[PDB]
C-alpha cells in the first residue's frame, strides 16, 4: 500500500512518531509558538505496532516485516524515521561479544552479515593444484538468506532513495563501509538477481554527488565492467561475461538493467573527467562502448522469457544516452585531440560521451538504424491500438529515441561549425538529411513519415506527438527539404490521410491555458495540458516557417492547397464539401471562431492568447503571399465572413497579455 | 639628465643598490660584508644614516618591503643565508656602542648554496619573500605577523633543475592573472637548452607549477624583470644575457574543457639588442614599465623605449667620461 | 547564455574570499538576470506597440489611397482626417511617449 | 567520530590527547572533508567556513590556495607537521583515503611522506596501480641514497664507507618490475623496466665499491 504515494501525502507518518525534534532552519514565515502538541492516540498505537511487530520476529514474519518497513519507509520523513528505527534496533549490544541476541532487523546486523558473506565467498576461491574428490561446498547462501538479503537490500534502497541523511550516514560509517562491501560482493560468484538488488542499492546511494564521485573511482578500480583489457587475456571479466553467458542463458536480464540504472543515476551526479587516468586514457567512452555495442546493438538479438523485458532493457539504456546528450554542450576542445602520458607513451584522451553520441547520430550508423527502426516498430505496434506486454516501456523507449534526435537537431549547427573552425578530419551528415535515408526494412525514405505518424496518436500519447511536432518544426526550417517532405507525405494517400488527421487532431483538441495556472490540479494533468499546448504551438511554428519557404511547402499541404496545380488555382472549400478533408486551416479558423456570437468576443483571445497570436499570423501569411491570397481572400468571405465577424470585437483587452494582443490586433489589421 | 655624486665608502665592491618605495631612502650592499642605508634630506642632499655588517659572505642583493609593512629590508649572501631587518625607532642600545637601529629580526638558512637573489612579493599577496640559490631552487618564505618579523615560514620550494641567478615577481594587482615568478639561470652547460623558466601559482594545486620555458634563451642569464602593468592584456618581461631581450607573454584564453592545468602563453620576442657589444648585467623598469634600463661591460647604462608603433629602440646612453 | 557566463566567472574566482562571497555573487547574478528579463519585456513591448501602430497606419493609408472617393464624401473624409490628425498628435506630444514610435507617427501625419 | 563529522577537529585531537585515542579518524575525516570539497558545489564551499573558523586558524595569510576549497588542505598539512610522533600512520591514512577516492596526491604530501617512508608510499602505489609515479619514486629514491638530494628522503647519510649501512625496498621493486612485465606487449612497460634495471646496476656497482672501501676500513 504505502509503497506508492502518487499525491505525495506521506500517510505512513501515522506509523511513525518523532523521538527527536527535526531542526530544519530554512523556513522563516510564521510567529505562532504552538507549544508541544502531544502525538494523537492513532499515531501512538500505530508507531507502537510497527515497533511491537519487531519484538522477537520469527523467521516466517521476517520478510513480511522488511516489506512492511519498505512500504512505511516511502517518503522523505518516512525514510528518515525508518533509518532511525533500524539504527536504534542496533545501538544496545556493547561489550557483550558472546550473547548473540541483537535485533536481526538493524543496520549493524545487516552490514556485518554482508561482510561475513564477503569474507566467506572470497576464501573458498579455487587454488588450482587441488584436483581431487571435493565434497559439496556447504557455504553457498541458501534461498532463505538470499530472499531475506533481497528484502533488506530493497528496504535499504527505498530508505536511501528518499533520505539524503540516510545515504551519507551509512557511507560515512567506518565499520560498515557499504560501497566497498557491495562492490566486493559483486566481484563474487553470487546469483545475478542478488547482484541486481546490490547494483540498485548502489544506484540509490549514487544520488549524493560526493558518494557518486567516489563510486565512479571505485567502479573503475573494481573492473565490474572491464575497461582495462590485457593483451594476453582470452576471456573478458565482469558484466560483459555475465550478460552474454548468464542473462543470455536465462532469457531474463536483471543484472544488466540494474547496471544501466546505476549509470543512469551516476550521469546526473556527473562523472570525473579524469575517470580511468593512468590505468587507461581518461573519460567515459569505455562505458558507452558497453552500453552501445554490448547492450543496445544486442537488445534485438537476444531472446526474452519476459516479452516485456525487451522493452524494459530499451528504456534504461536510451535514458542514459538521453542524459549524456541532454547535459553535454559542444566546445572547441572536443574537436582537439588532447594527448596524455601513459606508462611512457603519448596517447589521445577519450572524447566526451555527448560528442561520441553526436558523431554516432550524425552518420549512417547501426545506432541510427536501431533508433529509426525503433520509431518504425513503435508506430507499427501503436497503430493496432491494442494492449501488449511491456507497452508502457516501448512508449518510453520511443520517447527517449525522439528526444535524442531532437537534442541532436537542437545542437547540430554548433557541432558542425566547431568542426569547421577546428578543421578536424572527420565526416558527419545533417540529421535532417540522414532522416531521409532509405529505411532498409521498407525501402522508402519513410523515417520522417514514421515520426509524423505519432501525431495520429496525439490524444493517446501527447508526449510522443509533442517531440514529433517539435522535431518536424526544426526540419521545416530547411527550405531545401520542404519540397521533398511534400513528396514523401503525399506519395501514399492512405498515410497522407493519417498525417492530415494527426496535425488537425492536435489543433482541434479543446484544452485551455487556464488549467496550467489553477493550483488545485494534478501535476500530471497540468503537465499533459502544457504538453498538448506546446504541441499546438510547434505545429503553428512549423506552419509559419513553412509558409515563407517557396512553394511547394509543407504548410500548403497541411492547410489544403492543390499542390497538383498552380497554388493560385486552388478551390478551397469547407470540410466535407465535395469530399474535402478537414485541414489545419479549418482548425486555425475553429480556434478563432469559438465565441464570435458572444458579447465577450473570441475565446482563444482570452483562454489561449499565444495560440490566437500565431493563428492570426498564419492567416496573415495566407493573405499576403501572391498565390495563396486569391484562394484565401475568396474563402474567408464566401464561407466565414471572417474579417467582419472578427473586426467587430476590436480592440482586444487583458492587462496581462498586452504584447500578444497588440500582435493579434497587428495581424487582423494587416 | 643631470648627475649629483656621493662617496659611498664601502670597503670593497658594491654588488647592488635599491630605492625605497618613495625614492627618499636607498640601500647599498658590499663584499666588505656590510649594508648601508642613506636618506634624502628635505634640503635635497643625501646622508648615510646606518652602516652595519649584515652577513659573513659577500652580499649579492638588497631589497625593501612595501611601506604598509613598515621599514623592512632583506639581504642575500655567499654564506648561503638571507637576513630580514627592521628599522626600530628609539631602540639604539648604548650599552652596545656602535650597533645599528636596523635590527636583524631573522636569518633564513635553508639554501645549501650561495643565495643569488631576494625579492619581496607584490603587497596584495601579503608579506612574502622569495629567494633563489645555486642549488637550482627558489624558496618562498612568509611572515604570520607583520610585527613579529622574527617568525618566517617556508611555504614553497620550487625546483628549476638548473642553477638560479635572478628572480622576478609579476607586478599584476589584477585578480585575472594568477601569481607568477620568472627565474633566470647562470648555468654555462650546453646541455640545458633554456636558461629562463616561468612558474604560475596554479591555484588548483597550491603550487608554483611551471607554465612556460623560454626555449630561445639558450645563453646564461644575469638579471630578469617583469614590466609594471598599465592595464595590458599581456605581460612584458626583460632579460639580461649576452644581449638585452624583451618578451611579450599574452595569456591564451582557456576553452571551458581545459580544467586543472596552468595557463599557456602566446609568447613573442619584441626586441633583442646586442648594442652593449658585451654581456648585460642588470635590467630594471621605470615605475610605469614604458622605459627599460640595462648595463654591460661597455661601461654604459642604456635606456630603451617603445615608439608609437611598438618598435623598441635605444633612446639614451648614460656613460662615464673619466674626468 | 548570460546565466552560464556569469556562473562560469563565479567558478573561475579561485580564492578564500570568493568562496565566502559566492552567495552574494549568485544573489547579484539574480538581480542582473531579473533586470535582463525586464529589458527583454521592454524590447518586446516596444516592438508590439510599434508593430500595432504600423498595422493601424497601414489600414488608415489603404482607406485613403485605395478605397473609392464615392465611399467617403468630401466632408466626412475631411472630418475623419482632421480628427485622426489631432489624436495621432497628442499621443506623441505627451512627454512619456516612446521615441521608437516617432518614425511611424510622422510617417502617418505625412500621409494624413 | 561525531566531532570529526561536524569538523571540530582540534577538539577531537584534544579529546584523543586526554583519552590516549588514535588520531587516525581525525586525519581520515579531515581528508574526507577535503575530498568532498575538491568535488564540491557552491554550497559545500560556503559550508566549509563554518568548520574552518572553528579550528583556530585566525592567523591567516593569503596566496596559498587549492583554488576555492581552501583552508582545509592547509589545516591538514599543518596537522601532519604538528603531530610528528606517529607520522607514518597519518600520511598512510590520508594517502589511502585520497587514492580510494582517485584524488591525485598533493606534491607537498608526497615530499613530506618521502621523509618518513618512501617504501610505505611505494607499497601504496603498487596497491593502487600508480606504476609511473612508482618508477620515478624508485628513480629518485635510488639517487637520494646516492646523495642527489638525500634530505628529501629523510636519509642522514648517503652511501659511503664512512656512514651507517643503507636500505631499499627490493620486495616492492621486484613486484614493480613484475607489475610492468605483466603487460609485456607494451614497448614502454619494457622501457620503464629498463629505466629501473640499468639504474640499479649503476647503484649496485657503487654498493660493491662502498662495501670494498668499508671492509678495507674494518681489516686495518
Closest CA to B206 of B258, B171, B163, B157: B157
Distance from CA of C34 to the nearest CA of D (A): 21
DSSP string, A474-489: HHHT-HHHHHHHHHHT
B126 contacts chain C (CB < 8 A) = no
Closest CA to B172 of B112, B124, B107: B124
A670 contacts chain C (CB < 8 A) = yes
Give the cell for residue B171: 607586478
The C-alpha atoms of residue D188 and residue D197 are separated, in whole angstroms, by 14
Region class of B201: left (phi > 0), else alpha (psi between -120 and 50), else beta? beta
> D102 and A341: CB-CB below 8 Å?
no
Minimal Cβ distance to A662: which of C48, C58, C59: C48
Q: How large is the C-alpha radius of gyration of chain C?
A: 25
Q: First-to-last CA distance in chain B?
A: 18
CB burial of residue D123 (10 Å; 0-12, 13-18, 19+):
middle
Give the cell for residue D99: 587514492
Best B126, B203, B260, B263 residue to mutate vs chain D (most D CBs within 10 Å): B203
**Ranges of H-type helices in A490-625:** 493-507, 523-548, 554-558, 584-593, 604-607, 609-624
**Ranges of H-type helices in chain D:** 2-6, 9-18, 24-38, 42-47, 49-52, 72-82, 87-99, 107-113, 118-127, 131-145, 170-181, 187-215
The C-alpha atoms of residue A631 and residue A422 are separated, in whole angstroms, by 50
**Ranges of H-type helices in C66-98:** 76-93
Q: Taking a C-beta distance cutoff of 8 angstroms, is the pair D180, D192 a contact?
A: yes
The C-alpha atoms of residue B62 and residue B54 are separated, in whole angstroms, by 11
Helix (H) or strand (E) segment spanning residue A112: helix A107-121
> B125 and D62: CB-CB below 8 Å?
yes
Q: Taking a C-beta distance cutoff of 8 angstroms, is the pair A665, A609 a contact?
A: no
Distance from CA of C7 to the nearest CA of D (A): 10
Residues 6 or more apart whose CB falls under 8 angstroms from that of D204 comprise none
DSSP string, B46-98: EEEEEEEE--SS-EEEEEEPPGGG-SEEEEEETTS-EEEEEE-SS---GGGTT
Instruction: Residue window 89-108, chain D: list those with CB within 8 Å of chain A.
Output: 100-102, 104
The C-alpha atoms of residue A618 and residue A497 are separated, in whole angstroms, by 22
HSE at residue B120, side-chain half, CA atoms within 13 A, is: 25
Residues 6 or more apart whose CB falls under 8 angstroms from that of A270 comprise A209, A212, A327
Helix (H) or strand (E) segment spanning residue A144: helix A143-162
User: For residue A180, what is the nearest residue in chain D, using CA coordinates?
Assistant: D100
- Per CB-CB distance under 8 Å, the chain C contacts of A670 are 55, 58-59
D1 contacts chain A (CB < 8 A) = yes
Closest CA to A160 of A175, A149, A171: A171
DSSP string, A291-343: IIIIIGGGTTTS--SSTTHHHHHHHHHHHHHHHHHHS----GGGGS--EEEET
CB burial of residue B192 (10 Å; 0-12, 13-18, 19+):
middle
φ and ψ at D129, to 5 degrees? 60, 20
> D65 and B142: CB-CB below 8 Å?
no
Instruction: Residue window 240-299, chain B: list those with CB within 8 Å of chain C.
Output: 256
The C-alpha atoms of residue B241 and residue A213 are separated, in whole angstroms, by 50
Residues 6 or more apart whose CB falls under 8 angstroms from that of B305 comprise B290, B291, B292, B312, B313, B315
> A232 and D36: CB-CB below 8 Å?
no
Give helix D72-82 / helix D87-99 axis angle, nearest 10°. Answer: 150
Q: What is the resolution of this structure in A?
A: 12.0
Q: How large is the C-alpha radius of gyration of chain D?
A: 21
- Per CB-CB distance under 8 Å, the chain C contacts of B255 are none
Distance from CA of D186 to the nearest CA of A (A): 9
Determine how many CB atoms are found less than 10 A away from the CB of residue A637. Answer: 12
Q: In angstroms, how far is CA A97 from the centroid of its own chain?
A: 49
The C-alpha atoms of residue A591 and residue A654 are separated, in whole angstroms, by 18
Give helix A143-162 / helix A164-171 axis angle, nearest 10°. Answer: 120
> D183 and A214: CB-CB below 8 Å?
no
Instruction: Residue window 14-73, chain C: list those with CB within 8 Å of chain A.
Output: 41, 44-45, 47-49, 51-52, 54-56, 58-59
Minimal Cβ distance to D68: which of C19, C23, C26: C19
User: For residue B153, what is the nearest residue in chain D, using CA coordinates?
Assistant: D61
Q: In angstroms, how far is CA C68 from the centroid of its own chain?
A: 34
> A662 and C59: CB-CB below 8 Å?
no
User: For residue B110, what is the nearest residue in chain D, using CA coordinates?
Assistant: D151
Cell 590516549 sits at which residue? D20
Residue A552, preceding peptide bond in cis (omega within 30° of 0): yes
Determine how many CB atoms are found less than 10 A away from the CB of residue A154. Answer: 17
Closest CA to A205 of A193, A192, A188, A218: A218
Minimal Cβ distance to A217: which of D102, D186, D187: D102
The C-alpha atoms of residue B153 and residue B142 are separated, in whole angstroms, by 5
CB burial of residue A418 (10 Å; 0-12, 13-18, 19+):
middle
Strand pairing partners for B40? B46
Q: How large is the C-alpha radius of gyration of chain B?
A: 20
> B255 and A273: CB-CB below 8 Å?
no
Determine how many CB atoms are found less than 10 A away from the CB of residue B93. Answer: 9
By three-state DSSP, how is residue B316 classified?
strand
The C-alpha atoms of residue A202 and residue A316 are separated, in whole angstroms, by 16
CB burial of residue B114 (10 Å; 0-12, 13-18, 19+):
buried
Minimal Cβ distance to D73: which of B125, B128, B206: B206
Strand pairing partners for B301? B295, B318
Cell 561482510 sits at which residue? A115
- Per CB-CB distance under 8 Å, the chain A contacts of D25 are 174
D80 contacts chain B (CB < 8 A) = no
By three-state DSSP, how is residue B288 classified?
coil
φ and ψ at A230, to 5 degrees? -80, 135
> C51 and A663: CB-CB below 8 Å?
yes
Residues 6 or more apart whose CB falls under 8 angstroms from that of A198 comprise A153, A182, A185, A186, A258
- Per CB-CB distance under 8 Å, the chain A contacts of C56 are 669
Q: Taking a C-beta distance cutoff of 8 angstroms, is the pair A122, A188 a contact?
A: yes
B204 contacts chain C (CB < 8 A) = yes
- Per CB-CB distance under 8 Å, the chain D contacts of C3 are none
DSSP string, A536-571: HHHHHHHHHHHHHSPSS-HHHHHTT--TTS-GGG--
Question: Could you tell me which chains touch chain B, where touching means 3 or more CB pairs under 8 A?
Answer: A, C, D
Amino acid at each position: 500500500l504505502y509503497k506508492k504515494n502518487p499525491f505525495h501525502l506521506e500517510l505512513a507518518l501515522e506509523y511513525w512518531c518523532p523521538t527527536e525534534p527535526l531542526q530544519t532552519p530554512t523556513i522563516m514565515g510564521s510567529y505562532l509558538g504552538v507549544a508541544h502538541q502531544r502525538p494523537p492516540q492513532r499515531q501512538v498505537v500505530l508507531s507502537k505496532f510497527v515497533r511491537q511487530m519487531g519484538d522477537l520476529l520469527p523467521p516466517t514474519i521476517y520478510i513480511p516485516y522488511l516489506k512492511m518497513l519498505q512500504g512505511l519507509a516511502n517518503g522523505p520523513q518516512c525514510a528518515h524515521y525508518c533509518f532511525s528505527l533500524l539504527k536504534v534496533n542496533g545501538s544496545s549490544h556493547v561489550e557483550n561479544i558472546q550473547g548473540a541476541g541483537g535485533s536481526p532487523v538493524s543496520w549493524e546486523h545487516f552490514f556485518h552479515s554482508l561482510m561475513l558473506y564477503h569474507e566467506h565467498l572470497r576464501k573458498d576461491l579455487p587454488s588450482a593444484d587441488s584436483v581431487q574428490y571435493r565434497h559439496l561446498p556447504s557455504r553457498g547462501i541458501t534461498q532463505k538468506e538470499q530472499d531475506g538479503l533481497i528484502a533488506f537490500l530493497q528496504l535499504t534502497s527505498t530508505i536511501i532513495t528518499w533520505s539524503e541523511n540516510a545515504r551519507l550516514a551509512l557511507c560515512e560509517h567506518p565499520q560498515w563501509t557499504p560501497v566497498v562491501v557491495i562492490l566486493g560482493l559483486l566481484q563474487c560468484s553470487i546469483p545475478p538477481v542478488l547482484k541486481a538488488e546490490l547494483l540498485k542499492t548502489l544506484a540509490a546511494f549514487g544520488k549524493s554527488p560526493e558518494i557518486a564521485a567516489s563510486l565512479w573511482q571505485s567502479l573503475e578500480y573494481t573492473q565490474i565492467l572491464q575497461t582495462v583489457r590485457i593483451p594476453s587475456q582470452r576471456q573478458a571479466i565482469g558484466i560483459e561475461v555475465e550478460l552474454n553467458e548468464i542473462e543470455s542463458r536465462c532469457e531474463e536480464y536483471p543484472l544488466t538493467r540494474a547496471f544501466c540504472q546505476l549509470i543512469s543515476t551516476l550521469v546526473e551526479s556527473s562523472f570525473p573527467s579524469n575517470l580511468g587516468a593512468g590505468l587507461r586514457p581518461p573519460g567515459f567512452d569505455p562505458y558507452l562502448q558497453f552500453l552501445r555495442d554490448s547492450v543496445f546493438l544486442r537488445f534485438r538479438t537476444r531472446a526474452y522469457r519476459r516479452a516485456a523485458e525487451k522493452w524494459e532493457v530499451a528504456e534504461v539504456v536510451l535514458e542514459v544516452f538521453y542524459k549524456l546528450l541532454r547535459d553535454y554542450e559542444p566546445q572547441l576542445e572536443d574537436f582537439v585531440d588532447q594527448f596524455v602520458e601513459l606508462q611512457g607513451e603519448e596517447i589521445i584522451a577519450y572524447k566526451p560521451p555527448g560528442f561520441s553520441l553526436m558523431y554516432h547520430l550524425l552518420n549512417e550508423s547501426p545506432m541510427l538504424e536501431l533508433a529509426l527502426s525503433l520509431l518504425e516498430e513503435g508506430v507499427k505496434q501503436l497503430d493496432t491500438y491494442a494492449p501488449f506486454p511491456g507497452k508502457k516501456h516501448l512508449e518510453k523507449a520511443v520517447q527517449h529515441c525522439l528526444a535524442l534526435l531532437n537534442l541532436t537537431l537542437q545542437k547540430e549547427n554548433l557541432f558542425m561549425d566547431l568542426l569547421r573552425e577546428s578543421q578536424l578530419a572527420l565526416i558527419v551528415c545533417p540529421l535532417e538529411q540522414l532522416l531521409q535515408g532509405i529505411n532498409p526494412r521498407t525501402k522508402k525514405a519513410d523515417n520522417v513519415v514514421n515520426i509524423a505518424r505519432y501525431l495520429y496518436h496525439g490524444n493517446t500519447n501527447p508526449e510522443l506527438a509533442f517531440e514529433s511536432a517539435k522535431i518536424l518544426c526544426c526540419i521545416s526550417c530547411n527550405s531545401n527539404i520542404q519540397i521533398k517532405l511534400v513528396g514523401d507525405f503525399t506519395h501514399d494517400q492512405s498515410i497522407s490521410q493519417k498525417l492530415m488527421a494527426g496535425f488537425v487532431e492536435c489543433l482541434d483538441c479543446e484544452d485551455a491555458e487556464e488549467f496550467v495556472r489553477l493550483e488545485e490540479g494534478s501535476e500530471l494533468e497540468k503537465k499533459l495540458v502544457a504538453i498538448r499546448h506546446e504541441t499546438r504551438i510547434h505545429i503553428l511554428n512549423l506552419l509559419i516557417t513553412s509558409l515563407e519557404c517557396n512553394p511547394p511547402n509543407l504548410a500548403l499541404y497541411l492547410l489544403g492547397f492543390e499542390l497538383k496545380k498552380p497554388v493560385s488555382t486552388t478551390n478551397l472549400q469547407d470540410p466535407g464539401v465535395l469530399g474535402c478533408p478537414r485541414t489545419c486551416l479549418h482548425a486555425i479558423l475553429n480556434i478563432l471562431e469559438k465565441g464570435t456570437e458572444g458579447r465577450t468576443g473570441p475565446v482563444a483571445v482570452r483562454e489561449s492568447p499565444q495560440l490566437a497570436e500565431l493563428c492570426y499570423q498564419v492567416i496573415y501569411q495566407l493573405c499576403a503571399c501572391s498565390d495563396t491570397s486569391g484562394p484565401t481572400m475568396r474563402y474567408l468571405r464566401t464561407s466565414q465572413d471572417f474579417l467582419f465577424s472578427q473586426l467587430q470585437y476590436l480592440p482586444f483587452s487583458n492587462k496581462e497579455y498586452e504584447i500578444s494582443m497588440l500582435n493579434q490586433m497587428s495581424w487582423l489589421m494587416k | 639628465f643631470v648627475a649629483r655624486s656621493i662617496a659611498a665608502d664601502h670597503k670593497d665592491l658594491i654588488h647592488d643598490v635599491s630605492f625605497d618605495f618613495h625614492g627618499r631612502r636607498m640601500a647599498t650592499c658590499s663584499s666588505d660584508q656590510s649594508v648601508k642605508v642613506w636618506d634624502k634630506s628635505e634640503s635635497g642632499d643625501w646622508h648615510c644614516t646606518a652602516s652595519w655588517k649584515t652577513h659573513s659572505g659577500s652580499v649579492w642583493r638588497v631589497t625593501w618591503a612595501h611601506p604598509e609593512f613598515g621599514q623592512v629590508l632583506a639581504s642575500c649572501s655567499f654564506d648561503r643565508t638571507a637576513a630580514v631587518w627592521e628599522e626600530i625607532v628609539g631602540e639604539s642600545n648604548d650599552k652596545l656602542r656602535g650597533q645599528s637601529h636596523w635590527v636583524k629580526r631573522t636569518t633564513l638558512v635553508d639554501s645549501r648554496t650561495s643565495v643569488t637573489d631576494v625579492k619581496f612579493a607584490p603587497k596584495h599577496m601579503g608579506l612574502m619573500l622569495a629567494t633563489c640559490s645555486a642549488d637550482g631552487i627558489v624558496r618562498i618564505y612568509e611572515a604570520p605577523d607583520v610585527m613579529n618579523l622574527s617568525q618566517w615560514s617556508l611555504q614553497h620550494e620550487i625546483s628549476c633543475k638548473l642553477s638560479c641567478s635572478c628572480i622576478s615577481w609579476n607586478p599584476s594587482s589584477s585578480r585575472a592573472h594568477s601569481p607568477m615568478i620568472a627565474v633566470g639561470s647562470d648555468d654555462s652547460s650546453p646541455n640545458a637548452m633554456a636558461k629562463v623558466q616561468i612558474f604560475e601559482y596554479n591555484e588548483n594545486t597550491r603550487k608554483y607549477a611551471k607554465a612556460e620555458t623560454l626555449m630561445t634563451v639558450t645563453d646564461p642569464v644575469h638579471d630578469i624583470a617583469f614590466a609594471p602593468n598599465l592595464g595590458r592584456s599581456f605581460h612584458i618581461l626583460a632579460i639580461a644575457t649576452k644581449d638585452v631581450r624583451i618578451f611579450t607573454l599574452k595569456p591564451v584564453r582557456k576553452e571551458l574543457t581545459s580544467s586543472g592545468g596552468p595557463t599557456k602563453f602566446e609568447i613573442h620576442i619584441v626586441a633583442q639588442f646586442d648594442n652593449h657589444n658585451s654581456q648585460v648585467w642588470r635590467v630594471s623598469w621605470n615605475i610605469t614599465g614604458t622605459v627599460l634600463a640595462s648595463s654591460g661591460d661597455d661601461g654604459c647604462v642604456r635606456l630603451w623605449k617603445a615608439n608609437y608603433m611598438d618598435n623598441w629602440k635605444c633612446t639614451g646612453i648614460l656613460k662615464g667620461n673619466g674626468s | 547564455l548570460l546565466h552560464r557566463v556569469l556562473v562560469a566567472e563565479v567558478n573561475a574566482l579561485q580564492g578564500m574570499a570568493a568562496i565566502g562571497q559566492r552567495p552574494l555573487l549568485m544573489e547579484e547574478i539574480s538581480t542582473v538576470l531579473q533586470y535582463v528579463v525586464g529589458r527583454n519585456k521592454l524590447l518586446q513591448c516596444l516592438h508590439a506597440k510599434r508593430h500595432a501602430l504600423e498595422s493601424w497606419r497601414q489600414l488608415v493609408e489603404i482607406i485613403l489611397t485605395a478605397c473609392p472617393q464615392d465611399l467617403i464624401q468630401a466632408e466626412d473624409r475631411q472630418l475623419i482626417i482632421r480628427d485622426i490628425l489631432q489624436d495621432v498628435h497628442d499621443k506623441i506630444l505627451d512627454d512619456e511617449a516612446a521615441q521608437e514610435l516617432m518614425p511611424v507617427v510622422a510617417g502617418a501625419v505625412f500621409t494624413l | 567520530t561525531l566531532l570529526v563529522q561536524a569538523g571540530l577537529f582540534d577538539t577531537a585531537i584534544s579529546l584523543c590527547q586526554t583519552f590516549k585515542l588514535p588520531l587516525t579518524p581525525v586525519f581520515e575525516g579531515l581528508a574526507f572533508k577535503c575530498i568532498k570539497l575538491q568535488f564540491g558545489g557552491e554550497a559545500a564551499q560556503a559550508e566549509a567556513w563554518a568548520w574552518l573558523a572553528a579550528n583556530q586558524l585566525s592567523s591567516v595569510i593569503t596566496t596559498k590556495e587549492s583554488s576555492a576549497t581552501d583552508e582545509a588542505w592547509r589545516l591538514l598539512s599543518t596537522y601532519l607537521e604538528r603531530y610528528k610522533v606517529q607520522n607514518n600512520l597519518y600520511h598512510h591514512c590520508v594517502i589511502n583515503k585520497l587514492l580510494s577516492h582517485g584524488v591525485p596526491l598533493p606534491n607537498w604530501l608526497i615530499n613530506s611522506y618521502k621523509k618518513v617512508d618512501a617504501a610505505e608510499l611505494l607499497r601504496l602505489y603498487l596497491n593502487y596501480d600508480l606504476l609511473e609515479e612508482a618508477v620515478d619514486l624508485v628513480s629518485e629514491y635510488v639517487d637520494a641514497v646516492l646523495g642527489k638530494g638525500h634530505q628529501y628522503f629523510g636519509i642522514e647519510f648517503p652511501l659511503s664507507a664512512t656512514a651507517p649501512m643503507v636500505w631499499l625496498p627490493y620486495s616492492s621493486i621486484d613486484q614493480l618490475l613484475q607489475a610492468l612485465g605483466e603487460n609485456s606487449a607494451n614497448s614502454h612497460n619494457i622501457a620503464l623496466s629498463q629505466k629501473i634495471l640499468d639504474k640499479l646496476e649503476d647503484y649496485q656497482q657503487k654498493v660493491d665499491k662502498a662495501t670494498r672501501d668499508l671492509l678495507y676500513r674494518r681489516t686495518l
